[PDB]
Each structure stands twice: as structure tokens, then as C-alpha cells.
RNA sequence: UGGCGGUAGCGU
DNA sequence: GGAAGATCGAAAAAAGCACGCTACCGCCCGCGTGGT
DNA sequence: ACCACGCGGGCGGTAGCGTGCTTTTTTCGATCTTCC
């Protein structure tokens, strides 16, 4: 389908063409030439050569570089054929199926919070506001402060005091998942109770650093927000720092 | 995102997944060497039927 | 001890990249000043370690990925296999030093069959009991070394393993629950310490260092002219 | 010594015991000189464009009548300078104009004499020029070409460790590597034969190439193997015998000469037997008949009676063959001497295996292997073999390649031909055979003598040669096709291929890297970098352990400390301080020659190969007077090892202790007390420092800061000495001295300091004036300090009060606690400049234009914009504001009466023009500081561009007016003196204007003649200045070249003042790094007895673990320096007399233990002492050399000089409680750096944003506002926990379920936490992909 | 498509492959294909046809 | 506001 | 007692080479045409 | 002279381009070795 091979505009009057479209165009042109020459009563040698070219074009489309010389585009690199972007590290299996980008996520450096409890983690107020935006909108609609989603959008943008109170109330005991980039074992991702802090750095419990293999040398940590009752109970019971 | 097209090839072409992925499926089925299949597919030698 | 020794004492011998030991060691303290030659000599080990870590992280990650794949579909799906066959577990001793004792090796595991008291033909533990700390202490009090314990490799359950044949959860006092993804946990546990490892490529008689009796296994021998025994096995 | 003017302001105390003999050379000399060799005219054709032109030109077509020759080349004057190219975005380059002569011979004349000649100059593209700072300006961007470490051309011998066949037998190989041509390889096999491989293709027997070289079988046998002659004597066929040939073989027969049995049959030969045989001088001996049969026959023998070959070459003989030869009448035969211990029959075995028989068969086989599928013919095979190695056009061995080839073969001729010869191949094969036998040793690939450095010049020359040969073949075809009479050189050649190749090399090459601009040290390190990566080099993954290691030959050439950590470990290195490149390309180091036990001051540059032969003493060797060594035994490096040697065996000594380390590593004080890993990471990290608001000099330094600051182009350096006539924050005008006057010029020079210009890393570049009005200056002095530079000294950080102690866990594990006073004083506040670009192009419907009027926007949004449509300069802007208003036509247009009539009617033509105004990105705030407008020719210019042009013209007019004012003042003084020489007219002249002075005339004499001559000179000078101003105005108003389609570009610069905050990355110079944890109040930090609180608190727990003791020593030294500065400030506060200040400063400077530096304050004129004390009021800088720094005794003495404890630890009180601390803590002053890793820059948080259009997944990256990626190990960790609902929510609801996303959003808005699984879109994409691959895949419902 | 008559021993195949304008030899397998003389003879004379292919 | 390639860097 | 199954090492083809993140650059057919 | 597209495909050449891994799997000259 064309949507699986989109023609993204380049914002300069040109269209970026994917490798699949170019390979399909090559195959179509070769097939049309073969049909035209067959209708022309061409000699046996020419027909055989055209059939061989059609076979090679189909070969390049199905799996480029499998046999002979890999077909190269304007970049002087082999084209990403149909099977090229299925297998490998960049294939659909290992890039869009096993692991995928998710919403309601943030990332920042980690500092040491000595006052934090074992089940608590310091979260910046900006992250709490941005990540819990749908929850803030729902609470604002329930309280009657705003009548529509747009009014809640303006209220959140303007940073009203009622917005801050709503943010404090709605994330009072909503667990969040903290994860480090080299997640070796299951302890690399753990649930924590957010505590509103100022600044721009996530505060981490000193005790959990050993299990996290976490370094206050500038390491970066990511935070995700469970957003259903099942996930909230699951993080509270199975993945909280007090349960490990 | 769902509708798919089709192209009517002038002449049949084999699938390389069953031809070059060792062991060759056509060669195993027909009990012929892989190079014979490669030669006949790439228009090198006539094959009796 | 090594780091403080390097700080206040001599740095000791250093090794060239080929692995050979340099005749002249570094006799300068970190508190004192190291000349250019000593620093140039010492840089070799640091460079080797950094390169080893850099080129070993990827290998460890690949091994962890393969291990987590090979056991991704293994979960607990039963409570008891009923099999009376298990692995024969004894403490491991290498040379003149005991590597791992029985108590730590069989902690949090279930016996495949009832272990009897040595020499009395009296049962010491039940057939299907889980060996916790008290059971291990009782077993070691009676000087027991050989125990038949149920193992995952002998789990008779198909399309998964049974809770009993696995053992303790190793993270909670109770036994393993039903439905836990033991395969992923095991693979991650094996693959995590891969970084701690290293990728670096580098007697005519027996001695006794303790007091005790001597026992022989798989032996046929003969007495020599002087009377000393010589083994023919 | 006489201190320089900039040095007299603030002299840094030096603690170096060793006296320096050689000054630090220019750091960038590796680059600039190289580029000179690429552009300087060369009388002989071996370097630069001249060599390429001589290699390519001349040309002869298929018809000999036509010819084209090259005369000379000239580099044109660049249109714009560095600054104009940088601002305008054009590439800094110069035209390349070459003189070409087209000669048409007389076709009718058989001898082909000249008939017509046409000489003309032709332009063949723009060659990019490289700035005086060692950088390139490509497409308006600053790029740097790094050197490449590559295997040198020549013959290299290698031997694998026997793992190939897995029995311990090693397979030797010899590789011939030309600069340009076909790599050749000779390899051994387990069967002990020789195989030749060309370009890593199929192996062939090595004798094939010898046969193809017109060598017969017998010639090869004689050349590769010695022969033993067996002659038919009266009986037993006595042979000439050499005793040494009998070593190591069992006596198969009794040996006897002159009737004396030396040994009998069946007994092993002994060395005593060999010596006895040599003493006997035996030349003839008896031979059993069976002994000859074991040997093989070398020369084929034929008999005239039989007419057939009884024997041939190279096969095993036998008894029947021996009898046939004996009866044939032949009496003399020659056999091979085969001894398995030392002379293996590898050549004979290879020849037996070889199926070729003559030259034609070998050539046919070589052609078939070279080009499979082509018909083997005699002429084609001959041509291919001749061109493979014996053609200068195809095979080219460089001069360094020839030198290495001759050195490895032990030939005494360094110079030689650039092509291979038969003798060279024969010698290579013989050397390989000798290596296999045991004689000699294999070469080391990691040896620095086998690795060459290719600079920018060599790669540029290679790319130029490629373009030149392309244009050469193109011009060959054009000349052959075209009509000779009417062909002109300009249209004859095409500059497209050469220009394209040059542009691609300069812009898109792997080694053409974006130059960093964090600090001058980073730029210096980047310029002086050697990378094995690149074309014809090692790959990141396929590197191996061995190459990344530090070879012993790296001493003095490549520092072992400064190298990137991670994937690029051991592959990227930095040049040493004294390292330099030889003419061949090998690195060399300076050394001091030691003769007769004394160390002379003369220096010699020894390369890597020559270093091994001699023995060199270490730099840290004590020397008494006359240069004798105090110790009987000195440590030395003789052959890749360190050992003790006697005093009189030394031949060379290291120049300085900084030779081993690089410039970046040498900047770290107390390096000898730092661990190798910590020092490595500190040296790497120093390049990431960001300049602060105010540059603060390092209290503890290494003395190399001045060299780094001066060598870098960040600071302004006075080209000529003089006095500062005019000093200003914008420009500095200096009147040069009478001694240094260039003839025929005004005598003033103007420096325009760059101000608040964005760097490559979005960092502000600020140049601040240093000198004052009337202050004399001299050549080489610093006039204005660049970024992170103080008084001509590089300063990447600030001196802060540091106390080592845990503080309530806020310093847990390398965390840093920062007092509020740091934020209050803006010590580490930084400025960041960001670029925002708006493009107005020509669309199909209609061209877009910038206008103030924008649809459906409030007046508040348009308030920031001007009438033209661009935000005012200096206006504070935030996220969502409109910096520039742009509207694009849509739907319909070209209806102006309706537009005028309906400008505000309810239709408002909203669909006709849609808003496309550039807006500030969300989360970005700052102040607009610069606006640039670029407009293509033929398009009406807006008023803002007119104002920018008027400002530029005003600046140029001001400079030209200053110059003209100086010149006219001089000329009018001259004319006044001339008039006074005649009619004085003093009273009226004082009352008369100078142009009325020109108006006045004198009587007819020589005075009137010179008066009118001076008037003519005056008007000529005025006209010349008018022409110069007109040219400058024309250059300013010249239109800018834009991309096809865009007609205007607007660039806006936003300045952001970033202050320190928790989460920012801070660190020192010893590799200790951390993140700010809490901005503690000033009243909470611990304070001393005097009540002064500390600024930074560091955790001591990190000191013993990393073994970086140097930071503690630096802290103690900084404490001592700050105590000295405190004493100076105290004596300055009492208004004490200059005598006491002089005495105290002299006492402070004279402290030490036989330091090389001596300071005499008696020659400071009693006035510069006050300035020095004012500069030293903050503190006294101390220069601590790298490996020759101050000891503990000197530090303790310096501390005792001030009123400070000798132990370096004081008593502190807790700020909050006020109670005494149980133990004294270590306080002092430490140099802290702010890294380029800001916490606010790492901020990223997304709840619901844009999604990819192919996989329906959230985007990635902070700029694109995308969520974080849940990796595979994250899924595995969730599975280990037993997480199922959370995993499903992560995989479907949050990422791919398009319906699920909307349902969940509407549920959360409604307050219900209900989840719908749906089905991921990526699974459907995969299903469609597999279906399109001809493979059925469907979901089975039942 | 272009038919070429020449002797390989006079002009080598590599030279023809390097001729300007010619892309590559029509080769089946390693060796270039040889056109039989009958095909050339039949294509030289009566191969052209007045039938219009583009409709 | 889409990706590909190259380069450099951060964290292990 | 010269051929057919075994094999044996030697050569050749194929697949994989940790994860997150940040910034910059360049590039997003390509040249040979046809009407004006 | 620029502006726009339209059929093709490695490139420019009257040839040749590559050139520092390891492990697994497949095939084949060539023996070999056992014997039909
Ligand atoms: Zn079981």
C-alpha cells in the first residue's frame, strides 16, 4: 500500500522518494519493456536478455544484494529492499515490535535526595505538569473550573495556582516508573512515589543507587507514568522499591 | 494503508527466498544442484522437461 | 588494600601489552612524583583495561540477548511433577580448598527423595520438603553431604516447569509462585555480571594439608618390591 | 631575562627545577606548513599542484598533431575574506587559473613539427583556502581536516601465530603496498609452498609471475637455489664438496679424503668433524651411486646421440635416470643443495605444483584469474601484465614507499624509481624465503615506523589528481572529436568533475569534521589530532585489541593519556608538544646529543626507526654542571625497553619532561600524582569546558596556558609594535613605531574584535580589550582576550573555595554542593547563542513575502514586530512569539481590488493567504541580538537590509576616514613645512584653513613646483581613497547567492543567559566529575575561624578510590597561593609604601629550591610593581610543570610564608548548628570547570504529541518532541517482574493502538481508567509487508 | 541494442566494453554471448515492419 | 516536525 | 583391481557484531534532452 | 540562457574499482580406501 511507502514532502518543492518506490518503478519499467519487445517479435537473444533483466529487477526488489551487485541509489549505498527492512537490527521485528517509543515519558539527569523515603523519588514540577496533562484536564473538568478541553489547555499553559493544586492532588499517590538506559536485570526499572521538587533534576534515593547501578556523574534516567488502575496496582505491589 | 496492488509479470520469475537461502528449496525439491537452477533461471542452459 | 597500597606504598611490577612482566617495577608513590618513564609504563595497563571494557560491553550485551531469547518461553505452569528422580548434589571441593559447601549450594531447594541419616537407616528429612535455613542447619548438624534434589532439567512438566521442581523464588521466603517468568529472570541473572568478567587472553606428587582418613575410588593396584603400593588404574 | 609587556602585568611563579633548552614549537605547524606544500610554487614536481599537473600533463591524442601542455598555475585573489564568507555563508575559496598551450603539429610533415600555438589562461574551479588559524570555511561553516594514520607503502612481512592451521606451524606472508596500484601478496601454506595473490583474489603459484617475467625454469632454479657440481672422475663420480653443507645430516656413507676416514656410514656428523674437514681443505670426495638419486637435477640435459632430454628441470632423480645419464656420455651434472634445516625446497615444490610450462601459459593463467569471463588473448594478457606493476600511470610507489622498500631489502639507495621491477620481486621472494628459513624477523605492523601521517595537503592533492585525470580523459575525448583550428582552451576543458571532487572531499569526507568551539584548548586538540578512521583505514568494529594498545614507540610522538573513551579508544590520538612530521610522513622527536659524557645544547630530530638503534636517557635525569650525570647508573630506553645503563654509554637525552604528554594532558597540574585513567578522562573532559561570564585565571597552572592562548586565534595579537592610539570595546587602532614602519603607508592598524558571535556549539565568542590608551605594545603581545582567556592566559574555569567533607549525604558519591554565593556572584553564568532561520521562497501559487500584517493574530503578537515584519533588535522574546511574519498564498490570488476593498471585511481573504510566520520554539527564551537578511538579485530589498548595509558602509567609511585623516594630516604637515621653507606666512597660516593652505600659491620657483606636485599627490590620494570606498560599498551591496527556489532568508540570533542550577555537570582538571545537588544558602555552609564560608564541598570518598591524589596537592597549592594573595591585598589595604610591597613580592618569588625562574623587582621602575600587586591581589598564579612540578617541601614552605597551617587542614564550624567539627578538614582553592552538559538542555517530557506516518509510533528526540523508547531489555525486565497489564499498556495503548489512544484519552478526561487493547498498527504493517513478499500470512480466527 | 561484428584477437572485448556510449556487453554467464549469423542475416533485411506499435 | 549516511560526544 | 561411497581438508558463502540519549553536517534521482 | 520533464539504471571508460573478524554452514577437488 502507498501509505507504507509514503512520499514525504521536503518543504522545498521536492519529494523524498523511498527505496521501495524506486524498486517498484524499476520493475514496472522492465516489465513494460519486456512486453513491448515481445509484441515486437524480437529475436530470441533480445527476449532472453530482457527476461534476465526482469528477473534481476524482481530479485533486487525482493532482496537487494542477495545475488550479484547490490543496486545502489543516489547515495552510492545499497537500496533498502522489502526484505532489507524486515530483518536485522533496523528491521520491523527488532525496532517497532519488541521495543517501541511510548508516550507519557520523560528523561533527565539524577541527583541525590537524602531526605527522600525509600518508596519516594523527587520529581520536577514541570515533568509532573506535562506528564499528567490528561489527568489535570480531567480533574479540572470534574471540578467545573473549565467547561471545555480548550479552556483547560489555556489554564495549564497560563500556570494558574489552581492548576498547581490540581497537579499536587492528582499525583499524590500515583506511582511512576524510573528506568536506566542499560537495563541489565529487572532492578533497572523500579516504581516510586513522586514528590514535587523544584529545579530541573530528578532526585533519586541513595540506597537504591547500588541496585540501579546508578551514578551521579551525570547519568540520565527515564520516567514513565502508568495510566490505568491495573498498571497502578501492578507498580505498587510488584515493582515498588520497598518490594525489592 | 490496507489496499494492495498487483503487477502481471510478462514472464514468471522465481522467488530468491526459496532459491538462494541455503538450502535451496527448488533444488532440494527437484534434486538438482543449485548452480543448475541458477543457470536455467538466469538464461544460461536449456533444461529438458 | 590494593588501592591504599598503591597510594602509600610502591606501585609494584607492571606488565607490557604483550603480557610479559617488566624487570624494573615502579618504585614511586602516588603521593610522591612519578617520572615520565614510570607513567608511560603504567599507561599500558589502563589502556588495556579501557579497551577491554569498551570491546566487552557489546559481547556481554549480545550474550545476554541470546540467553534471554533461549529461555523466553519458560514459565511455571504446575505445582508438583511427582517425579522421584533428581540431580545428585554434593559440596564442590577443588584441590586442597573447599569451593562451595553443601548448605549454600542446596539452600532454598526441595529434595527429590527423603534423605536418610548416615549409617542409621533413619529418615532425616521428608521426601518433598523445602530446605530452608533450619532444614539446612539440621542437615549439616548430622554431617550429611550427598542430597538428591529436584532440578529444572528433570522437571517432567511439559510446556513449562512445575513449582516444586524449580525451588525457592530466591527473592521471597515462600516457594515460587505459579506463572512467574523464571526463564527471563534466570537469563538476566546470568547475563548481568558479564561486564564484571574479562576478555583478556592471558608438580610430581600429591600433598595433604589436613588431617583425616584416605579413601580410594576406582582403584586396582599392586605392591612393589619395597612394599609401596602402585596403582594400575 | 626581560619579561614581555603583557607578562610584566602578572608574572606566574615557576616551580620547575630543570632549565628548558628548547622552546615549545608552534602547535598548529603540522597543518599550516602542510597546506603550504599544497599551494606553494614548487620548482621540482613532487609537492603541490605542480606535481599533479606534471604527472597529468602533457597529453597526446590518437592523432599526434594535437597536443596540450601546462605552463604555470596561479591562485586568484578571494572575493571575500574570512569574516565575509562566515557571515554570508559562502565558501572561502580562491580561483585556480592555469596557463595552457594548445599546439597543433603539421600533419603533412612526417616529423610532426609545430604548426600552430595558442596560449591562454583558463579557470578550472575554486580551490578552498585555509585560514591562518588552521581551519577551513566551507559553506559558511568552520571545518577541520584531521590527519590520518595509515599503513606506509612498501614491503611488509607478517607471520600469523599458527592458529590458521592449528598445529603451531606459522604461515608467513609478504605484502607489497603501493601508493596507487595493485596490492601484491606472497603467502606460505602448510605444505611449504609460495602462492601469489593480487587484490585479495584467488591464490596462484608464485612461480607463475616469475615465468611471466621471462624467466625460464633453469634460470629460476639457479637464482633461488645454489648448485652443487657432481663430476665423473676416474671412479665413484667425485663431486666438489663444502664442509658446511654437511651440517645436520646423517652420514649415509663413509667419508674419507687423503686416505683418512673422518666418519663412517651410519654416524651423525659433529661440529668437530666439520672443523676437521675445514682444516683438511677437502675439495673432492667419493660418492655412492645412491646418494645422487636423493638429490634433484637443476639443469636439463640432452644427448646428441639420443636426441631426447634424458633429464629435465626440477624433479626427483633415480637410479635408472642416473644410469641413463652415465651411459649417455655426460660427465658433469648440477644438483640442488636441499637442507631442511636451513634451505627448504619451497621453490621446487611450488614449481612442481605449478601447472604452467612457459611464459605464454603463465600469462594466460594470470589474465584468466585477473579478468574472468574474458577471452584470453596474447596481446591483452601482455598489456594487462605490463600495466599491473610495470606502468608508472597505473602502478606508482611513493618516495616514502620506495625508501621503505629499499630499507626492508637492505639496499643502500634511498632514492629510486616509483614502479616495481623484476629484481625487486626477486629480492622480496628471497627475503620471504629467508624469513621462513629462520634468518631475520618479521616486521611489526603496530610499529610507529611502519605507520605514516597523511595531512590535509596529501589528501587534497590526491583528490585533485583524481579530478585532474578525469578532466584529462574528458579533454582527450574533446580534443579528438573537436576541430583543432577553432578549438579554444577555455571551452576545451570542463571544470565540473574536479570541482565536484574537491567540494565533496572538503565537505562530505569522513575526516572533514565539524570543528568544535567549546574552548581554545578543544580547538587546539581537534586541529592536532591523528585518526586511523577514514578511507583506507581501520573500521570502528573491526579494530582489534592489538591496535588500540600503546606501543613503546609512542613515547614522545603520541601521548598515551589523551584519547577518546568508548568506541574510539586507541584509534584517535593527539600529537605531543614537541612532535612533528618528517618530510616522508613519519613522526619524529627532538633529542639532545650526549657526547663524551656531557649534554650539548644541540638538538636532533630522531624518527621512530632511528630511535631504536640508539640509547636515550630519561628526561627526569639529574644533571650537574657541564652536563655530567650525578649518578653512575642512569635509566634509559635502548630497544623498546627500560633498563639501567652506565654513564658514558648514553647517546641522547629527552628535551623536556612534557615531551611524552600532549598539549591537553600537559595542562593538568600535578599529573604525576594522577592515575592514568583519571588523567585520561580529565584531559578528554577539559575540552568540554564552557566559557563563563568573567574569565578567572587558574591559581595553579602548568605554564602552558600562554602558549595555547597565543597559538589559538581566539585572542588578538599585535602584528607590529607601537602604541595604542585608540582603545574601544569594538575596535582597537594602534600607531606602529618608527622602527617598524612599512614604507608608503599611514602607519596605523585596526583590529575589529568579534563580539557575541555564535560558535559551532551555540556558545558566545567575546573578545575584550586588554590594553589601555597610551600603553606601548610590542609584536606578539595580546591586545584583546578571547573567550575563556585572561591576560593572555587560557582560563577554562574559576578558582573556588573547596572543602573535602561529607555533608548530610548531599555529597553522596561525587555529588557537589554549591553555595548560594556562587549563583549570586554569577561565577559560572554562561551565554548561549541560538540561530533561527526563516525562508521565503517562490511557491507554485505565488511567491511568499515578509509583511507585518498576519491573519487572525492579536495586536500584542505584532507589537514585537516592526513595520517591515521583523522583530526589533534587543526585544525580549519567549516561546510562541512571532520573530518574523510570513504568509503564503493559497487557494486563489492575483486579485488586488478585492484585497484592497476586503482588507478587513468579514471575508478577510483568510484562505487566500495562510500564516507561515517563524515562531520561537517552545521552551526557548532569550533576547534578539542580531538580524541578518539575505536577498537574491532581482528582488526588491526590504528596509532592514538597507539599514544593515548602511551600518556596514558606515563602519567601512569610518575606517577609511581614519586612514585618510592620518594621511592628510601628514601631507598637510609636509606642505606647511614646504611653504615655511619658502614664504613662512606663519601668522596667516595659523589663521587659514588647510585647504585654503592648498589654495595659496607662491612665486615661480622650485617651491611652486613642489607645491603643485604635492597638490597633485593630494588629489590622487583622495581619488584612490574614493575608489577604495566605492569598492568596499560595491562588495557590501553585492547580492548573496541562494538556493534555486528561495528568494529571501532571515536569520535571527537569540542570546540566553544560563545560570547554574542543580543537575548541571561540574568537574575539575583531575577527572573528578559530578552533578550539583543543592544550592545551599550562604549561612549553611561551614565557615572557618575568620567566618569566611566555603563555596564547594566535595566528598573525600572519591579520592582514594580513583587514586587521583593530584587534586589534593592542587588544592593545597591553591590555598597557599590564595594566602599569598590575601597578604598582598592586606598590605594594599593599609596603603603601605612601595618598598614593603617590593620586598614581600621578591621574597615570595625567590621561594623555592633552585628554581630556574628568577625575578628581579629592582628593574620595574617602581611603577609596574603597583600594577603587578594589583593583578596579584586576588592571588598569586603558580606554574607547576607536568613532571617537574613542586614538591611537598616547597608547598609547605609557601604555606608557612603566609599565615596558614603547614598541614593544609584548618578547623571548620557547621553552619546550621555552629558546633565544632570533630576532625580538621582539608580546605583550599581548586580550579573548577563547567562542562557543556546543562540540565535544562536535557529536559524532555511528552504526554501526547505527533506520531510517525509510517508506523504510527511517537517520534524521538528532544527537538521533535517525542517520547522515550522502551527498549528490548525494558520489556524483558517488565516480564521478569511478571508485569503483563503494564506491558500491554506500554506496547498497545501508549504507542500503536490508534483507536486505543483516543479511547484512553477520552476515558482519562472522563476520569475512567479503562484500557482497550485493540491491535498494534506495526503488526498490521508487518503483515502487509510479508504479504507483499509473496508469502501468505493471516490471523487464524478459529 | 546494437550488433557488432569484429574479431576478438584484433580488437579485445575489454576495449569494446570501454567504448564511449556502449554500456555493457550482452553476456550470458562469464563469457559474452555469441549471436549466430543466421539471426543477423534474417534481421538485416526483412525484420523492419510497417506495423505501428505505439497506438 | 520525516527519514538515511557520516562525524563527534554523554552514560555504563 | 579400476570404479563407487567416505571423507577430508580446503575453499567459499552467509550472518552478526549492547542499549538509551545529544549535537552538527550533507542528502533525499540524474543526465539528456524539448519549447522558448 | 533557464525551466521543466522523461524514460533508465554503476561509473567512465576507449579500464578497472577491493586490500586489518569470527563463527557456522555448504560444496568440492582430491584422495582414499574399500571393494562390486
Ligand atoms: Zn517439576
Author numbering:
A (entry chain J): 246 to 489
B (entry chain J): 99 to 147
C (entry chain J): 734 to 935, 947 to 977
D (entry chain I): 1 to 1342
E (entry chain P): 54 to 108
Sentences from the paper on this structure:
To ascertain that our conclusions would hold in the presence of NusA, we assembled a NusA-modified opsPECRec and determined its structure at 3.2 Å resolution. The cryoEM reconstruction revealed that, except for added NusA, this complex is essentially identical to opsPECRec, suggesting that NusA binding does not induce changes in opsPECRec or alter the KOWβ presentation. Thus, NusA could cooperate with the RfaH KOW domain to provide additional docking sites for the pioneering ribosome.
RfaH, a paralog of the universally conserved NusG, binds to RNA polymerases (RNAP) and ribosomes to activate expression of virulence genes. In free, autoinhibited RfaH, an α-helical KOW domain sequesters the RNAP-binding site. Upon recruitment to RNAP paused at an ops site, KOW is released and refolds into a β-barrel, which binds the ribosome. RfaH recruitment requires a 12-nucleotide (nt) operon polarity suppressor (ops) sequence, which induces RNAP pausing.
